[PDB]
């Protein structure tokens, strides 16, 4: 009772020191030092391909490791794996629970995993000797809707759900070898680092945390946003990440600086961001929106450079190929466009 | 290039077989209607069901396959996983009217569903599920609606009321006041695309499914008239 106030009194005071440490480490804005670089211009982005086989909204997709095969999850019980070059669908995986909210493609190109509101992160095996596609594991240890999951290895799937916690599953036996706690609200999206040694998670409390896959405890906390956190992804360098909230304001954070770098906001937009991803060089920040069309944000100037279109419903997912050759976006219109 | 030619030709046969299966399931998917169910903890949502996170209940009424499911596993927060139900035919909102204290909380939830950006085009079928307890409370007179709803002192039975035989006027005034409290919420922001269908039902009613089939039909029919520039 009384001991809580003294700890709270000291916790606030040392929290101010962190603010002072951040203030002392705040020399000048990134925008001021970067004003002397040449702008990218106006990127002419066109619908090079269209993929139409889904019966309802597409909620997420994940580009394969070969930058050719992509997998899309639509709320119909169908997990369809397309061939981007030839428009063919290699497999049409029938799910058990129709309401799927996430999907992932193995970096080895053998396993595909999905699972949404059913609280189960099913994992499907592709290359089988039986000639069919079956389920390899049924990871069921969460209490709350399962929002996003990205593989780390062929046995190291990392899952983030709606129970304010993230888990590092083990496909071999199916038990959670680590469970990360510390968030206060729903955790929506997470991105793994290029070296896969530490990842981040965006939560529905205007805060992003830095997790460690092996040690298993929170490392850094980032809170400068206004509302929920719908999407998040690392800078390709692996030492930075930018996230999009539901207040129509993308922000870019730097791990070493432990601050907020840029505020990707426009005085007109009032529609929140639903997906963020980078290009192969990190210059182009392609952020989806609720205003029915995407955007291309110059990551080093915070000035919009090019606006995409072609979707008659909101865009929810936006993935970039491994080689950076093309970007594919899926929308709630059941239309998975491939854009180069 | 013979080996290469056998690859893309194999994909076309693979694509043709898959596309045939997909079209077979396309017709089935369009022939089943989804109905999100949500209400209060003691409202009695499972009571209407008289046929994990999601409990599915499929019933076939008048040769039309319905698909009604309840979401119970997830926590109290619902501002993120409710956007997943914007493609359903209707939303079955069952709420109890016996507990007056837990009625204003339900009013905010219905208002929150009504004025939602992605749920603004979803008709809400309203159910009241504890009429037996509602009649007993007002007839007993120990608990007054006035202390929780001061606007009930100046309310009269509407001219369109259809009270059941052998029913006290006090019950009828209480029944329709709550209904007119929900309807005032819906009609204040009804843009003509989504509607409310208030209903009264106790826990022993037998035709709790026909009242949805006779209302999902009206909702879809009103959708076709509006999309033909005809309504």
């Amino acid at each position, epitope marked *: 009772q009384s001991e809580l106030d003294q700890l709270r009194q000291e916790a606030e005071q040392l929290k101010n020191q962190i603010r002072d440490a951040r203030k002392a480490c705040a020399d000048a804005t990134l925008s001021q030092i970067t004003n002397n670089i040449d702008p990218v211009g106006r990127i002419q982005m066109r619908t090079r391909r269209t993929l139409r086989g889904h019966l309802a909204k597409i909620y997420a997709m994940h580009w394969g490791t070969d930058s050719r095969l992509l997998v899309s999850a639509s709320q119909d019980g169908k997990l369809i794996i397309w061939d981007s070059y030839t428009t063919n669908k290699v497999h049409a995986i029938p799910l058990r629970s129709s309401w799927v909210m996430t999907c992932a493609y193995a970096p080895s190109g053998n396993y595909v995993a999905c699972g949404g509101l059913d609280n189960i992160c099913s994992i499907y095996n592709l290359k089988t000797r039986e000639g069919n596609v079956r389920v390899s594991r049924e990871l069921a240890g969460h209490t709350g809707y399962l929002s996003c999951c990205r593989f780390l290895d062929d046995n190291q799937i990392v899952t983030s759900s709606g129970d304010t916690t993230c888990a590092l599953w083990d496909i071999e036996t199916g038990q959670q070898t680590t469970t990360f706690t510390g968030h206060t609200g729903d955790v929506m999206s997470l991105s793994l680092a290029p070296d896969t040694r530490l990842f981040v998670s965006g939560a529905c409390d205007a805060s992003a945390k830095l997790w460690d896959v092996r040690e298993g405890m929170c490392r850094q906390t980032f809170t400068g946003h206004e509302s929920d956190i719908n999407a998040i992804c690392f800078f390709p360098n692996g030492n930075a990440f930018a996230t999009g909230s539901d207040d129509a304001t993308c922000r870019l954070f730097d791990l070493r600086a432990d601050q907020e770098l840029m505020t990707y906001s426009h005085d007109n937009i009032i529609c929140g961001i639903t997906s963020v991803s980078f290009s192969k060089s990190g210059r182009l920040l392609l952020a989806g929106y609720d205003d029915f069309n995407c955007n291309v944000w110059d990551a080093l100037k915070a000035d919009r450079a090019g606006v995409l279109a072609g979707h008659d419903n909101r865009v929810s997912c936006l993935g970039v190929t491994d080689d950076g050759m093309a970007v594919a976006t899926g929308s709630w219109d059941s239309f998975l466009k491939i854009w180069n | 290039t013979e080996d290469q030619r056998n690859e893309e030709k194999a994909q076309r046969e693979a694509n043709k077989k898959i596309e045939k299966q997909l079209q077979k399931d396309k017709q089935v998917y369009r022939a089943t209607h989804r109905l999100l169910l949500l209400g209060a903890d003691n409202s009695g949502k499972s009571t209407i069901v008289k046929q994990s996170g999601i409990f599915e209940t499929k019933f076939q009424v008048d040769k039309v396959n319905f698909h009604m499911f309840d979401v119970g596993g997830q926590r109290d927060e619902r501002r993120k996983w409710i956007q997943c139900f914007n493609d359903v035919t209707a939303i079955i909102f069952v709420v109890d009217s016996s507990d007056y204290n837990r009625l204003q909380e339900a009013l905010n939830l219905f208002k929150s569903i009504w004025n939602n*950006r992605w749920l603004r085009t979803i008709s809400v079928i309203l159910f009241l599920n504890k009429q037996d307890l509602l009649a007993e409370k007002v007839l007993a007179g120990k608990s007054k609606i006035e202390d929780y709803f001061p606007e009930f002192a100046r309310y009269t039975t509407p001219e369109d009321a259809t009270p059941e035989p052998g029913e006290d006027p006090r019950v009828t005034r209480a029944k329709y006041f709550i209904r007119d409290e929900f309807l005032r919420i819906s009609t204040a922001s009804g843009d003509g695309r989504h509607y409310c269908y208030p209903h009264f039902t106790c826990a022993v009613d037998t035709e709790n499914a026909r009242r949805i089939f006779n209302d999902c039909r009206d909702i879809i029919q009103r959708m076709h008239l509006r999309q033909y520039e005809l309504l």
Partner: nanobody
Amino acid sequence: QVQLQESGGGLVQPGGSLRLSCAASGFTFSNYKMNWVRQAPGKGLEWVSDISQSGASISYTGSVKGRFTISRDNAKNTLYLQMNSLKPEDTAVYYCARCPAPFTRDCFDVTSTTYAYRGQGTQVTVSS
């Protein structure tokens, strides 16, 4: 970081007056439909009143209707709730809840057990 610090009152005899000051910072105050929620001891969370972005649309719960005045000052980034004619059933803790998303007519999932954009709360008790 969004913070909602509150400065209210304590023990007051029934029929008295109290004023609740809700100091807010860290967010654009003008775009958010703040609410007011209370939790009586041994009871759940219940909603009291809400006020729109500009202060035009105001609603109240039935029990607290006709006794409480809610007003916001978008210039100084603060919210007010002035109460008169207290009742023994007003003994509760008050939270100056915010709204999850800007520019939304419906403020959804605000009385949840675990919520993020909600203040610590202050204790308001009436007795002799």
